[PDB]
Design a binder for these strands. Structure first.
Ligand SMILES: [Mg+2]
Ligand SMILES: [Zn+2]
Ligand SMILES: [Zn+2]
Ligand SMILES: [Zn+2]
Lengths: 171, 174, 98, 268, 84, 93, 105, 549
RNA sequence: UGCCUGGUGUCUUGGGUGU
């Protein structure tokens, strides 16, 4: 789910960049170091609002190292999945152990043990799919799934979905 | 890396059950609590975003940045290519693809009317912003379907759920 | 091994009198046995069985080896004493008194 | 005991808790290295000598400024406004004499460490501007009076327009202002030192600048300096005296070795 | 909140010796780390000497933040502090 | 560099020289502290780039400090005696 | 107290500036009572536990601080010395910031 | 830059919060449980897991990495283990406070003996300082010798008479006036009884007593689980080439663990109370002496050599303790010491440094485009030729030693590198003589490299240092940074220290034969010929080239 | 082509050096 959050970043600048263009350079450095990153605490930062008018304040010189430390506060759009949430998805891969879907930047893996039994995996089909009499879910097929668990990594998030309840599966 | 405006949170002895993330129970944790603080420390509400609002905001910000980088002189692929960072480019491409392929409302005025309906309504004055975002995003059609998908709305029976759903379906472009 | 030089030692591991020595040079060569490792796998007898316990000359001192004494202690083991000689000429900073 | 004491940027002397030890370091805000023994000239001497040295009379001719030292001696006698100014100066001097003699230094000691050496400044001015020769000065009396009066208001120890700040600032420079007014009197300037105009503005500017340079610097660790300055003599050193007495004082012993009183009797 | 406005600054308008020493050290270190120099260098090569030359001409791009005991502070530019 | 030399350096007012003498020219050390419990119990693995405090079960609110090795030893000896010195990088009032 | 201290110092003809003895006797009488320069006078203040334990009675002070959950604000000079930090003294009594306005020249 | 990169942000300590360690926290922060008294597995390397030298506790060997963090010896801080105690024991440092708390509360209902109804009690509670609050509450509630089951309405008390507690070594005796005179019984107050009484103290009463609910809870003063420090705290020493020596703390922990095992074994098998009392008292003694071996009123714990055991408390106190001997003042690098001598031909702020000391000490100079040529020359000259260099340090922090480099001429210096060049002329250095009585005993001079092996001083500075040349020695300290060099040259320099703040008079003057000769030379009947005047005038460095008439 | 090494106890005690 997408949100607006007020975040802050600590930026350290080398003395070789102490020029008139210091502020703009700090702005592009912030944009390059925040746009697209993935933090387990917050999720995924997709964009920074008002990216060219961010206040940086006054940097403090670190005693003994010369480099200046800047405290940058900004508002950004953040997306983070939650346990027990039902969202739309697009299937990216089909495999005997289960199928992998994509919910924005997040890639969700659904095991066969969380798939209804009638959706038997068909490897002979082109492309291979988990199909039933009235349902056929393959690569590129819209699916509505509920996120059950989320795994936190260093700079990545792994989520597990399920389609075993009602109003789920193919859409 | 990035630090939230909420700090402190030192050691204690009591342990609470409203600490674990759970969408059904509407327990979003401390960093996503209902009450937030801005850079001035004033009171602030949690700001959820539906796919329509998120798409509008991301498109506006990206096109503003693209115009600024060209000296103030539309395509999603070009707009994604505007940003810097190969991984950032891929992430914004994936988010844009998701938003485009599931955009319930691609018009500013439709989204504005939807937000006005979901905010100014007397029944919706109690609705949690997460519930509002889920309703505007999943595009549910039935009261039973919405309740099954959103367990929180089951306990809120003072909501004109069916007619609001029909209003959303009407506002949804066929 | 110590970082000094072992080239001034004789066959018996003792330096001989009349040899000029400098700081960190090895004047007594001694080794202590160590249980061998699995290096007997493919080492052509070139596997470490002993550990060095040599005595180096003091880092700030140098001189001539004056006299080397070799004898047996009360327990019947070998026992050596090495005496080093040098000449100290007065210079700026030396203390004198009436 | 004294390690964590430091002069802060508002002039106060505080410990690590922020508790105030002194409201102004050394009660004058000066640095220990920027003071010298000087004599305050209004304290000593009989009343006749004080009057002879400092009083100027513009009505009586033989009790006035000598005519060969000033160019404008013709149009001075008989002026009443200038006499009012001189009377105000002399009343200020008499008030300073009373304050120093009855309150601060009752025993009459007049040699005390004070900032910026005035004698050195005056003789430097005399050497710089060649103030020898019997040439008459062009320095009018109102310039002298107003210059000294304005100088006695530019010795900033504390900045700010607060009334309590102004009162503290006035208190902090009382002794030094007494010294300055004792030295830069009208009669002494015109007769004893024979300064001209340019020498006079040079002296005023130099006094102000040196006083500004003699203040204490925020960030001094004055507690450690005081502890070292007290403990250093102790290493090189019927009533108890010496290290045992210092140990008695510091420990605040209840029962000292030789308790004593100093009973003073009535005048008769 | 904690910052004190420029109009109501009541600290001394002079560069104390501790501030002078710290400013010279920081500027010398920054110059030794290839920071741009804001004054013309005739034949000088020592970073400390270049820093002193910059200070004499009031060209050091640093700000002193003086901490009052209660936690409030005053920000003084090194170009507006009087140096002896 | 005993205590009297430290007092002389305090009297001179040279804080940078004192810090350099007692840290860079001597036992300098780097530790990680949990941002919650405030203890030096973070199990930091620099090569794998993962930090983790088991007691508080957090992976994010973690900072690093530069302290003398003797200070680390003193705090560990205090913890050996059931005393818990907690180091915090922010004030609270 | 000042008179007694000056009498002790000046007996052998030595001279110590007034401000030092003034500071000492202002410290000894700042609490409303005579504070002796001993452990019973200095260590009975509200200063930080780390600062107090560095003088005398280290282990007892540390236990008393632990049992009473004392909080040390690290404002003293001993605390910052024993933690390898820039003490708030002398050249460390302020902060240096970078002047983004002046760099525009 | 000497530390390997870590992505965690670098901050500085702003607050130190003290308190006690709860058993829950001790169990949580631990990484292994210590239960086997045997230090070594089978005396075949690989110390026994679960023992006092478990590899998970940390590594002190160069070739062995820690099994918990995976870092090397230089980076592993050590990790704690915990030891479960069979029976709770008193903490030796809190017994008087435990006795006071027992006097302040009731031993049955676990509530304070006084309430806010008493005006004095409310006044005492009004105070803020926890220590003074506890002192006042104890002074009041000490007098109250009986619990009240009714208001002095029920106040929550049980009405039982409060016993009087007396201290005897590590044991507390509680005497009840059981029911003019009758037979009173005094019985031992076991640590477990006091612990389970303290656990029933309400948080409000705990706050009223001066303890903190979050950080210092009263029942944490009784030890139920013991933290085992890592081997970094108790390193082993190799006495000779073969046999290494276990530390005192390791032996004491082995004794404590053996006593714990003995108590556990005795409890499950068969329970004569006399044997149980003896063994539990032995365990209490071992735990107490592990943390404090100077308990007055009982014999100390002794080693097999007869020396007393060095408890943890003894590590922290004295001149050689942790605080005085390793934190307030410590040994430092980049320093020199030698005999001093006098030189009339040195400026006031100059010190003469021997060539060998100048070669040994060094100053890391950052390579820039103002000095790259000179620094390359220094690198070529090598560590044996003056001027020279000892190391070249890259940006990543790697050190290139110039003694063991065969291709020193094949080194190109990049901007931002550091060259640890030799000490050169006009380098500011701090100079010191002990004892340092005042701040003029440490002053910064300018280096001048000279032959022979003594420091050389202008004789005017021998007064502030209280030094003469009959054998005195002085210390030299080299700054290692631009900031520190600036501080030395702008604050501690000798010319700035001529006038002292102690007596606002100079501390340096003309001394000795210069004073005698300036008296003899300035007599009224001293006349000098032209040829000697010319030589005397040329000797003045500041002379302007004009001879006086 | 035969090819080069940095790693140093601890605890007591005693006698001394400069103040
Ligand atoms: Mg001597
Ligand atoms: Zn933690
Ligand atoms: Zn480890
Ligand atoms: Zn009771």
């Amino acid at each position: 789910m997408f949100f607006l959050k007020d975040l802050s970043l600590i930026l350290t600048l080398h003395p070789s960049y102490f020029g008139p263009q210091m502020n703009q350079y700090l702005r592009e450095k912030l944009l390059t170091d925040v746009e697209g990153t993935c933090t387990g605490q917050f999720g995924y930062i997709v964009t920074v609002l008002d990216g060219m008018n961010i206040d940086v304040g006054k940097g403090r010189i670190i005693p003994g190292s010369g480099s200046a430390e800047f405290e940058v506060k900004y508002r950004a759009v953040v997306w983070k999945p939650f346990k027990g949430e039902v969202v739309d998805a697009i299937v990216s891969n089909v495999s005997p152990i289960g199928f992998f879907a994509d919910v924005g930047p997040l890639n969700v893996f659904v095991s066969t043990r969380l798939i209804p039994d009638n959706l038997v995996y068909n490897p002979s089909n082109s492309p291979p799919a988990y199909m039933s009499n009235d349902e056929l879910i393959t690569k590129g097929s819209k699916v509505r799934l509920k996120v059950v668990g989320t795994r936190t990594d260093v700079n990545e998030i792994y989520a597990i979905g399920s389609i075993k309840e009602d109003f789920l599966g193919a859409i | 890396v990035s630090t939230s405006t909420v700090g402190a949170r030192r050691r204690r002895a009591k342990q609470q059950v409203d600490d674990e993330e759970n969408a059904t129970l509407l327990r979003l944790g401390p960093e996503f609590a209902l009450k937030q603080y801005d850079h001035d420390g004033n009171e602030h509400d949690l700001i959820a975003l539906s796919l329509s609002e998120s798409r509008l905001l991301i498109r506006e910000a990206l096109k503003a940045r693209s115009r600024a980088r060209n000296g103030g002189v539309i395509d999603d692929d070009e707009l994604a290519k505007v940003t810097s960072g190969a991984v950032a480019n891929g992430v914004v491409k994936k988010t844009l693809d998701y938003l485009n392929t599931f955009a319930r409302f691609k018009d500013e005025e439709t989204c504005t009317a939807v937000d006005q309906l979901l905010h100014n309504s007397s029944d919706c004055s109690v609705l949690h912003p997460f519930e509002i975002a889920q309703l505007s995003s999943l595009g549910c059609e039935d009261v039973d379907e919405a309740i099954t998908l959103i367990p929180s709305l089951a306990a809120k029976k003072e909501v004109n759920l069916q007619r609001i759903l029909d209003e959303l379906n009407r506002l949804e472009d066929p | 091994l110590k970082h000094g030089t072992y080239e001034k030692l004789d066959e018996d591991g003792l330096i001989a009198p009349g040899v000029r020595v400098s700081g960190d040079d090895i004047i007594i060569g001694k080794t202590t046995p160590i249980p061998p490792d699995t290096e007997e796998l493919g080492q052509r007898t070139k596997y470490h069985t002993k550990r060095d316990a040599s005595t180096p000359l003091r880092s700030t001192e140098n001189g001539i080896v004056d006299q080397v004494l070799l004898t047996t202690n009360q327990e019947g083991l070998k026992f050596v004493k090495v005496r080093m000689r040098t000449t100290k000429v007065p210079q700026i900073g030396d203390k004198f008194a009436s | 005991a004294l390690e964590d004491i430091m002069v802060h940027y508002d002039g106060t002397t505080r410990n690590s808790l922020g508790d105030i030890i002194q409201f102004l370091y050394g009660e004058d805000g000066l640095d220990g290295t920027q003071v010298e023994r000087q004599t305050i000239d209004t304290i000593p001497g009989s009343d006749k000598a004080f009057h002879k040295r400092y009083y100027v009379d513009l009505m009586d001719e033989k009790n006035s400024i000598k005519p060969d030292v000033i160019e404008y001696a013709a149009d001075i006698l008989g002026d009443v406004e200038l006499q009012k100014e001189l009377n105000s100066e002399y009343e200020q001097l008499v008030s300073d004499r009373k304050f120093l003699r009855e309150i601060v230094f009752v025993n009459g000691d007049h040699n005390w460490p004070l900032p910026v050496n005035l004698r050195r400044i005056i003789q430097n001015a005399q050497q710089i501007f060649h103030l020898d020769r019997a040439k008459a000065s062009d320095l009018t009396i109102p310039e002298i009076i107003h210059g000294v009066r304005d100088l006695c208001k530019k010795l900033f120890v504390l900045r700010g327009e607060n009334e309590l700040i102004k009162e503290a600032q006035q208190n902090a420079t009382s002794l030094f202002q007494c010294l300055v007014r004792a030295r830069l009197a009208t009669r002494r300037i015109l007769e004893e030192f024979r300064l001209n105009r340019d020498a006079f503005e040079w002296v005023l500017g130099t006094i102000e600048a040196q006083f500004q340079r003699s203040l204490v610097h925020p960030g001094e660790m004055v507690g450690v300096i005081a502890a070292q300055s007290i403990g250093e003599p102790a290493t090189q050193m019927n009533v108890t005296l010496g290290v045992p007495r210092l140990k008695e004082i510091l420990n605040v012993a209840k029962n000292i070795k030789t308790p004593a009183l100093t009973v003073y009797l009535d005048r008769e | 909140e904690l910052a004190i406005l420029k109009e109501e600054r009541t600290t001394t308008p002079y560069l104390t010796k501790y501030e002078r020493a710290r400013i010279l050290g920081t500027r010398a270190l920054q110059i030794s780390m290839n920071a741009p120099v804001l004054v013309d260098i005739e034949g000088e090569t020592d970073p400390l000497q270049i820093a002193m030359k910059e200070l004499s001409q009031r060209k050091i791009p640093l700000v002193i933040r003086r901490y009052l005991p209660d936690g409030s502070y005053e920000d003084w530019g090194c170009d507006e502090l009087i140096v002896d | 560099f005993g205590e009297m030399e430290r007092d002389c350096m305090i009297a001179h007012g040279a804080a940078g020289f004192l810090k350099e003498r007692l840290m860079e020219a001597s036992d300098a050390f780097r530790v990680h502290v949990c941002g919650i419990c405030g203890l030096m119990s973070v199990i930091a693995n620099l090569k794998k780039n993962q930090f983790e405090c088991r007691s508080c079960k957090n992976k994010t609110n973690i900072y690093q400090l530069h302290i003398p090795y003797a200070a680390k030893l003193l705090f560990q000896e205090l913890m050996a005696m059931n005393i818990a010195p907690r180091l915090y990088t922010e004030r609270s009032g | 107290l000042y008179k007694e201290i000056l009498n002790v110092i000046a007996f052998d003809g030595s001279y110590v500036n007034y401000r030092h003895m003034a500071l000492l006797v202002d410290v000894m009488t700042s609490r409303g009572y005579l504070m002796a320069i001993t452990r019973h006078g200095i260590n009975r203040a509200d200063t930080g536990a780390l600062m107090r334990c560095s003088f005398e009675e280290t282990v007892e002070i540390l236990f008393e601080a632990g049992a009473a959950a004392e909080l040390d604000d690290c404002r003293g000079v001993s605390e910052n010395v024993m933690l390898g930090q820039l003490a708030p003294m002398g050249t460390g009594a302020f902060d240096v910031m970078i002047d983004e306005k002046l760099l525009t020249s | 830059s000497q530390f390997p990169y870590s992505s965690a942000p670098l901050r500085s300590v702003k607050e130190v919060q003290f308190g006690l360690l709860s058993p829950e926290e001790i169990r949580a922060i631990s990484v292994v449980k210590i239960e086997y008294p045997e230090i070594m597995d089978e005396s075949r390397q690989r110390p026994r897991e679960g023992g006092l030298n478990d590899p998970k506790l940390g590594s002190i060997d160069r070739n062995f990495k820690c099994q918990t963090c995976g870092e090397g010896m230089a980076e592993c801080p050590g990790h704690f283990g915990h030891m479960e105690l069979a029976k709770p024991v008193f903490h030796i440092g809190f017994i008087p406070k435990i006795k006071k708390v027992c006097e302040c509360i009731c031993m049955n209902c676990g509530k304070l003996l006084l309430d806010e109804t008493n005006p004095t009690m409310a006044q005492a509670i009004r105070i803020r300082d926890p220590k003074k609050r506890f002192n006042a509450v104890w002074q009041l509630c000490k007098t109250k010798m009986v619990c009240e089951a009714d208001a002095p309405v029920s106040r929550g008390g049980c009405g039982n008479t409060q016993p009087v507690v007396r201290k005897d070594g590590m044991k507390l005796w509680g005497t009840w006036k059981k029911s003019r005179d009758a037979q009173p019984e005094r019985k031992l107050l076991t640590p477990g009884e006091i612990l389970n009484v303290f656990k029933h103290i309400s948080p409000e009463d705990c706050f009223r007593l001066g303890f903190n609910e979050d950080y210092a809870r009263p029942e944490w003063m009784i030890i139920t689980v013991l933290p085992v420090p890592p081997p970094q705290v108790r390193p082993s020493i190799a006495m000779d080439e073969t046999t290494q020596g276990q530390d005192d703390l390791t032996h004491k922990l082995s004794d404590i663990l053996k006593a714990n095992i003995n108590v556990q074994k005795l409890e499950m098998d068969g329970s004569p109370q006399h044997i149980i009392n003896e063994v539990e008292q032995l365990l209490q003694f071992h735990v107490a002496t592990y943390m404090d071996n100077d308990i007055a009123g009982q014999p100390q714990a002794l080693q097999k050599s007869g020396r007393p055991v060095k408890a943890i408390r003894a590590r922290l106190k004295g001149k050689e303790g942790r605080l005085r001997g390793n934190l307030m003042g410590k040994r430092v690098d980049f320093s020199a010491r030698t005999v001093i001598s006098g030189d009339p031909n040195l400026e006031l702020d100059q010190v003469g440094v021997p060539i060998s000391i100048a070669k040994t000490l060094s100053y890391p100079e950052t390579v820039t485009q103002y000095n790259i040529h000179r620094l390359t020359e220094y690198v070529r000259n090598g560590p044996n030729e003056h001027p020279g260099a000892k190391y070249v340090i890259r940006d990543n922090g790697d050190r290139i030693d110039l003694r063991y480099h065969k291709r020193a001429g094949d080194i190109v210096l990049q901007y931002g590198w550091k060259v640890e060049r030799h000490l050169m002329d006009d380098d500011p250095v701090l100079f010191n003589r002990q004892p340092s009585l005042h701040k003029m005993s440490m002053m910064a001079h300018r280096v001048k490299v000279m032959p022979y092996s003594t420091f050389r001083l202008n004789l005017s500075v021998t007064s502030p240092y209280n030094a003469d040349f009959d054998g005195d020695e002085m210390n030299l300290h080299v700054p290692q940074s631009e900031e520190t060099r600036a501080e030395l040259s702008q604050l501690c320099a000798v010319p700035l220290q001529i006038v002292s703040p102690q007596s606002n008079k100079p501390v340096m003057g003309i001394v000795q034969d210069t004073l005698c000769g300036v008296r003899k030379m300035t007599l009224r009947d001293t006349f000098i010929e032209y040829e000697q005047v010319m030589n005397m005038l040329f000797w003045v460095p500041s002379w302007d080239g004009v001879v006086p008439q």
